[PDB]
Amino acid sequence: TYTMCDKTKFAWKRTPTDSGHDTVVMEVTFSGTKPCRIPVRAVAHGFPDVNVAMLITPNPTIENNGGGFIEMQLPPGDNIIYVGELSHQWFQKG
């Protein structure tokens, strides 16, 4: 089993966007020690204690050469996506 990637070392390569097929997709790059599991979560705005990210890519990792693609579904309304310390406000249509 992998350690969790250092949450300080992510950058957006593709910011959260609609996939076409009713999911949210994104891509990150990671500059730290590999390989590792990506810490990804999301919250409804104002409700920081309950994860709402439903991961379609279930155990996303940074491998020694690849990784960084993440796909998820989010509940309707105003959310915040986190990849490590990376944060993105996201409105999910009903």
Partner: antibody, heavy 120, light 108 residues
Framework: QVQLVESGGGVVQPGRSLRLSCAAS????????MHWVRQAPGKGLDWVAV????????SYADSVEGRFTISRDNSKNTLYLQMNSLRAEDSAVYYC?????????????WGQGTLVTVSS | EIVMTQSPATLSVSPGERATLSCWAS??????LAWYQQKPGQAPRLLIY???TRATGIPARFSASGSGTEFTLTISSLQSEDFAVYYC?????????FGQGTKVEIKR
Amino acid sequence: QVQLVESGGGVVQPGRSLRLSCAASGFTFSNYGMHWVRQAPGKGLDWVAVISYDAISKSYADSVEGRFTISRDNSKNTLYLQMNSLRAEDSAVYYCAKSPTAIDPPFDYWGQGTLVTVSS
Amino acid sequence: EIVMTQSPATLSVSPGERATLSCWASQSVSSNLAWYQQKPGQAPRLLIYGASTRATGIPARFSASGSGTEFTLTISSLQSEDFAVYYCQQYNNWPPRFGQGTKVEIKR
């Protein structure tokens, strides 16, 4: 001012166990990764183990896997290393080292080390 | 699984001269490479991280470069406190392994 103070070293007979601790002060301990590194007399630096800031992630050198356990107590600012089944080859100065980030090296601050001697 | 090798084993140079130390990785470690200084009887001190960035409190005569599999640490105008052992360390891949060290001594 960052300080790291190791303790628990001493003489231990082969096959037996020893717990080291490292008392941290002068920074927010619970924000960073912490490592152990060891150095046998006259030899080089030898990374031993890591624990992430939130204690969820741990990793070990192949030479100690299955025999050593790293843990930490964020409420007490203390890092631990449980060393079981010790061998002569584990004799070394054991250093407590801090990460500037959540888990990764490099090691921005080091303690003075505690001496472990595995001998009869 | 990544072997770090330093060269030379011992470098002998005079006060005020330049010392150039090499660190080789058996596979690319991108820029995730650190250098440390260790004086006899003391704990190590971080000098360089990210292959070329000086750590805090490190003076300008220490500089370092490289990427991939070859790295260099250069100590310009060696001063008395500069003579020590230097270690590199790759942290691109778990586990983050040290080189065996290069001793910099005074040539007289």
